[PDB]
Design a protein around this motif. Structure first.
Motif, PDB file in Angstrom:
ATOM      1  N   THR A  80       0.864  -1.209   0.000  1.00  0.00           N
ATOM      2  CA  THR A  80       0.000   0.000   0.000  1.00  0.00           C
ATOM      3  C   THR A  80       0.889   1.244   0.000  1.00  0.00           C
ATOM      4  OG1 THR A  80      -1.467  -1.162   1.515  1.00  0.00           O
ATOM      5  CG2 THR A  80      -2.003   1.140   1.040  1.00  0.00           C
ATOM      6  N   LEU A  81       0.516   2.260  -0.764  1.00  0.00           N
ATOM      7  CA  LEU A  81       1.249   3.540  -0.837  1.00  0.00           C
ATOM      8  C   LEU A  81       0.257   4.676  -0.604  1.00  0.00           C
ATOM      9  CD1 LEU A  81       3.949   4.844  -1.411  1.00  0.00           C
ATOM     10  CD2 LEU A  81       3.279   5.012  -3.814  1.00  0.00           C
ATOM     11  N   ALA A  82       0.456   5.465   0.461  1.00  0.00           N
ATOM     12  CA  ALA A  82      -0.327   6.672   0.808  1.00  0.00           C
ATOM     13  C   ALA A  82       0.387   7.916   0.269  1.00  0.00           C
ATOM     14  CB  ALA A  82      -0.536   6.767   2.305  1.00  0.00           C
ATOM     15  N   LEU A  83      -0.237   8.581  -0.688  1.00  0.00           N
ATOM     16  CA  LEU A  83       0.346   9.760  -1.367  1.00  0.00           C
ATOM     17  C   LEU A  83       0.211  10.961  -0.443  1.00  0.00           C
ATOM     18  CD1 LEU A  83      -1.166   9.470  -4.959  1.00  0.00           C
ATOM     19  CD2 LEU A  83       0.952   8.463  -4.040  1.00  0.00           C
ATOM     20  N   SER A  84       0.939  12.023  -0.764  1.00  0.00           N
ATOM     21  CA  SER A  84       0.821  13.375  -0.178  1.00  0.00           C
ATOM     22  C   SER A  84      -0.482  14.029  -0.648  1.00  0.00           C
ATOM     23  CB  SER A  84       1.998  14.205  -0.583  1.00  0.00           C
ATOM     24  OG  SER A  84       2.153  14.145  -1.988  1.00  0.00           O
ATOM     25  N   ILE A  85      -1.005  13.644  -1.807  1.00  0.00           N
ATOM     26  CA  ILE A  85      -2.220  14.285  -2.369  1.00  0.00           C
ATOM     27  C   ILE A  85      -3.345  14.197  -1.326  1.00  0.00           C
ATOM     28  CG2 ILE A  85      -3.957  14.192  -4.158  1.00  0.00           C
ATOM     29  CD1 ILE A  85      -1.417  15.239  -5.297  1.00  0.00           C
ATOM     30  N   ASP A  86      -4.030  15.321  -1.082  1.00  0.00           N
ATOM     31  CA  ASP A  86      -5.333  15.412  -0.379  1.00  0.00           C
ATOM     32  C   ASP A  86      -6.444  15.495  -1.423  1.00  0.00           C
ATOM     33  OD1 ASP A  86      -7.670  16.107   1.062  1.00  0.00           O
ATOM     34  OD2 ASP A  86      -6.444  17.090   2.589  1.00  0.00           O
ATOM     35  N   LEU A  87      -7.198  14.417  -1.579  1.00  0.00           N
ATOM     36  CA  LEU A  87      -8.195  14.290  -2.669  1.00  0.00           C
ATOM     37  C   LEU A  87      -9.217  15.425  -2.580  1.00  0.00           C
ATOM     38  CD1 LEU A  87      -8.967  12.588  -5.053  1.00  0.00           C
ATOM     39  CD2 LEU A  87     -10.326  11.142  -3.498  1.00  0.00           C
ATOM     40  N   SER A 116      14.247  25.191   2.896  1.00  0.00           N
ATOM     41  CA  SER A 116      13.965  24.142   1.901  1.00  0.00           C
ATOM     42  C   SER A 116      13.718  22.800   2.596  1.00  0.00           C
ATOM     43  CB  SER A 116      15.067  24.003   0.921  1.00  0.00           C
ATOM     44  OG  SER A 116      14.571  23.339  -0.226  1.00  0.00           O
ATOM     45  N   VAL A 117      12.655  22.118   2.197  1.00  0.00           N
ATOM     46  CA  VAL A 117      12.340  20.706   2.531  1.00  0.00           C
ATOM     47  C   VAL A 117      12.159  19.955   1.219  1.00  0.00           C
ATOM     48  CG1 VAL A 117      10.655  19.204   3.684  1.00  0.00           C
ATOM     49  CG2 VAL A 117      11.313  21.388   4.728  1.00  0.00           C
ATOM     50  N   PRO A 118      12.739  18.741   1.101  1.00  0.00           N
ATOM     51  CA  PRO A 118      12.619  17.942  -0.111  1.00  0.00           C
ATOM     52  C   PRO A 118      11.162  17.684  -0.507  1.00  0.00           C
ATOM     53  CG  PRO A 118      14.184  16.911   1.435  1.00  0.00           C
ATOM     54  CD  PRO A 118      13.502  18.052   2.154  1.00  0.00           C
ATOM     55  N   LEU A 119      10.840  17.825  -1.791  1.00  0.00           N
ATOM     56  CA  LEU A 119       9.507  17.533  -2.375  1.00  0.00           C
ATOM     57  C   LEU A 119       9.147  16.089  -2.068  1.00  0.00           C
ATOM     58  CD1 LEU A 119       9.889  19.415  -5.762  1.00  0.00           C
ATOM     59  CD2 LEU A 119       7.957  19.595  -4.259  1.00  0.00           C
ATOM     60  N   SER A 120       7.897  15.802  -1.736  1.00  0.00           N
ATOM     61  CA  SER A 120       7.380  14.415  -1.557  1.00  0.00           C
ATOM     62  C   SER A 120       6.029  14.280  -2.247  1.00  0.00           C
ATOM     63  CB  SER A 120       7.250  14.033  -0.116  1.00  0.00           C
ATOM     64  OG  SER A 120       6.708  12.728  -0.027  1.00  0.00           O
ATOM     65  N   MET A 121       5.807  13.151  -2.927  1.00  0.00           N
ATOM     66  CA  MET A 121       4.482  12.758  -3.481  1.00  0.00           C
ATOM     67  C   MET A 121       3.867  11.679  -2.596  1.00  0.00           C
ATOM     68  SD  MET A 121       2.695  13.939  -6.271  1.00  0.00           S
ATOM     69  CE  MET A 121       1.803  12.389  -6.160  1.00  0.00           C
ATOM     70  N   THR A 122       4.594  11.243  -1.582  1.00  0.00           N
ATOM     71  CA  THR A 122       4.092  10.271  -0.580  1.00  0.00           C
ATOM     72  C   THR A 122       3.840  11.018   0.738  1.00  0.00           C
ATOM     73  OG1 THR A 122       6.365   9.524  -0.290  1.00  0.00           O
ATOM     74  CG2 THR A 122       5.038   8.274  -1.778  1.00  0.00           C
ATOM     75  N   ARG A 123       2.888  10.535   1.535  1.00  0.00           N
ATOM     76  CA  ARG A 123       2.591  11.119   2.867  1.00  0.00           C
ATOM     77  C   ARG A 123       3.898  11.231   3.658  1.00  0.00           C
ATOM     78  NH1 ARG A 123      -0.991   7.541   5.258  1.00  0.00           N
ATOM     79  NH2 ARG A 123       0.808   6.990   6.561  1.00  0.00           N
ATOM     80  N   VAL A 124       4.265  12.442   4.088  1.00  0.00           N
ATOM     81  CA  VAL A 124       5.388  12.685   5.043  1.00  0.00           C
ATOM     82  C   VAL A 124       4.848  12.583   6.474  1.00  0.00           C
ATOM     83  CG1 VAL A 124       7.149  14.378   5.744  1.00  0.00           C
ATOM     84  CG2 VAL A 124       6.576  14.086   3.337  1.00  0.00           C
ATOM     85  N   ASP A 125       5.388  11.661   7.262  1.00  0.00           N
ATOM     86  CA  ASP A 125       5.038  11.458   8.695  1.00  0.00           C
ATOM     87  C   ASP A 125       6.114  12.092   9.580  1.00  0.00           C
ATOM     88  OD1 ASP A 125       2.680  10.033   8.057  1.00  0.00           O
ATOM     89  OD2 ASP A 125       3.736   8.109   8.098  1.00  0.00           O
TER      90      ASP A 125
END
Length: 489
Positions: free
Chosen positions: A161-168, A374-383
């Protein structure tokens, strides 16, 4: 005589969710009916009935089976509903064997087509996150030993399972508002990126035109372009805040400083720098941004050197690889010199003579919004938020924030970018891709304690302050409330 072979057990592709666990891509059971021609050749009376029940035409069907009479293997049809899989298995036709398979379904469909992408005919990622995390998502097929008719050695491991950073929720809002903008301005195309300035998370990425990844029959490549990651443009006035950042880190400039831009032009030997509006003499540094004075920003750049400006633009990620490992991601170009002449210095400062993507610009605006970290770009949920790089001094970043707040609020400012309830900060521009026109707005909110950076691109609306800005306003208002950000006014 008899013979021992192997057939591989397909793996169940990992579920893709938005950051809240809303399924964005799901492996659904289907069945691929194949056949053994050798055995099929023994039941020719059944073929017309088989054929019809495969949509295949009677004679086209039989031509196929005859041509491949010797081949002991042939697919008949890939991935039917498991229930039509019976419709055929209900005929119990000799030579007809069958595999159990997964096909992807995209519940949000066109709303998130580009960010999610899609799988090929083999359940392999071909675009978007589906390609980019293909390894994580694709399981490991298993293996079965088959007694060729004239034990499972390792069972298949399922993908993760992969949880993206996107908020639908913000994705729907962005998708809608950018669709509406394109129609009202009669534009060809557009991108909108929303970024969490603290975590590097991409909360929303939308491009128009989009497509339904559930039905790509009449797919067109223009629809499939992930514009936010692949269209490179000259950012124009939207990078002047980075030029100003260097001005203020120089020791040589403060915001109340004045530049004389009369008469709205500046001769650079052979070159002439020319302002879009030429009704000014003395402007403070904020005025230089409000007016988007290329003469103003050029004079400051001559005083500090291009090196200092180039260095900030590099540190906030312009013309640099994003580290997102998406398929056709363009890097643009932040070109360097040993000796920067006046023209190259001036054109860098006012944001021609580099190329960037919407993602890079938003990332840079995120850095400035994150008090220069600066914080690195993420397309996955950052915890667990990674440590930032402090690329601009907190104090300079704070100053440039206030200036950008005035760009939106001050008299003569970009009033269509105000977010009702909140103080917002940002900068319009008029980009070049002949040489194409796009309307940009780049900003973040709330201005005094930023949470969200946003970039809007609108291709050939048939100005940034007129076209992109109102979209920034509507989508930012919604994003902030959806994220329960408290009004700062």
């Amino acid at each position: 005589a008899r013979s021992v072979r192997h057939i591989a057990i397909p793996a169940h592709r990992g579920l893709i969710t938005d950051r809240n666990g809303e399924p964005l891509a799901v492996s659904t059971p289907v069945t691929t009916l194949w056949a053994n021609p050798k055995e099929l050749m023994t039941a020719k009376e059944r073929w017309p009935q088989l054929a019809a029940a495969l949509g295949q035409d009677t004679k086209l069907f039989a031509d196929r089976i005859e041509q491949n009479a010797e081949r002991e293997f042939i697919y008949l049809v890939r991935g039917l509903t498991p229930e039509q899989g019976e419709g055929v298995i209900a005929l119990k036709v000799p030579g007809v064997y069958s595999i159990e398979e997964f096909r992807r379904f995209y519940p949000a469909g066109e709303v998130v087509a580009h960010a999610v992408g899609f799988t090929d005919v083999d359940d392999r990622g071909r675009e978007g996150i589906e390609l980019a995390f293909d390894e994580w998502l694709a399981g490991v097929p298993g293996k079965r030993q088959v007694l060729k008719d004239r034990q499972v050695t390792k069972n298949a491991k399922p993908g993760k399972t992969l949880a993206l950073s996107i908020d639908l929720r913000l994705q729907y809002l962005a998708h809608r508002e950018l669709r509406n903008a394109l129609l009202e301005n009669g534009a060809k195309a557009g991108s909108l990126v929303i970024m969490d300035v603290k975590t590097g998370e991409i909360l929303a990425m939308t491009n128009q035109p989009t497509y339904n990844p559930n039905n790509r029959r009449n797919l067109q490549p223009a629809a499939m372009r992930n514009r936010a990651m692949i269209d490179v443009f000259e950012p124009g006035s939207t990078v002047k805040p980075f030029s100003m950042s260097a001005a203020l880190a120089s020791g040589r400039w403060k915001p109340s400083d004045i530049v004389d831009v009369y008469p709205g032009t500046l001769q650079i030997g052979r070159y002439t720098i020319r302002d879009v509006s030429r009704n000014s003499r003395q402007l403070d540094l904020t005025g230089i941004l409000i007016k988007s004075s290329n003469v103003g920003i050029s004079k400051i750049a001559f005083d500090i050197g291009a090196e200092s400006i180039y260095s900030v633009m590099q540190q906030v990620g312009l013309g640099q690889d994003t580290g997102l490992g998406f398929p056709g991601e363009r890097v643009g170009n932040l070109p360097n010199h040993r000796k920067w002449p006046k023209a190259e210095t001036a054109t860098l400062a006012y944001g021609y003579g580099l190329s960037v993507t919407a993602i890079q610009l938003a990332h840079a605006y995120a850095a400035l919004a994150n008090d220069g970290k600066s914080v690195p770009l993420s397309m996955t949920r950052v915890d667990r938020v990674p440590d930032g790089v402090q690329v601009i001094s907190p104090e300079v970043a704070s100053t440039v924030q206030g200036m950008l707040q005035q760009v939106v609020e001050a008299q003569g400012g970009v009033f269509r970018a105000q977010v009702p309830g909140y103080h917002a900060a940002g900068k319009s521009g008029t980009a070049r891709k002949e040489n194409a026109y796009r309307s940009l707005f780049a900003g973040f909110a709330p201005a005094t304690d930023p949470r969200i950076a946003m970039v809007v691109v609108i291709d050939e609306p048939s100005f940034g302050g007129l076209v992109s800005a109102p979209v920034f306003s509507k989508v930012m208002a919604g994003a902030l409330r959806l994220m329960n950000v408290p009004p700062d006014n």
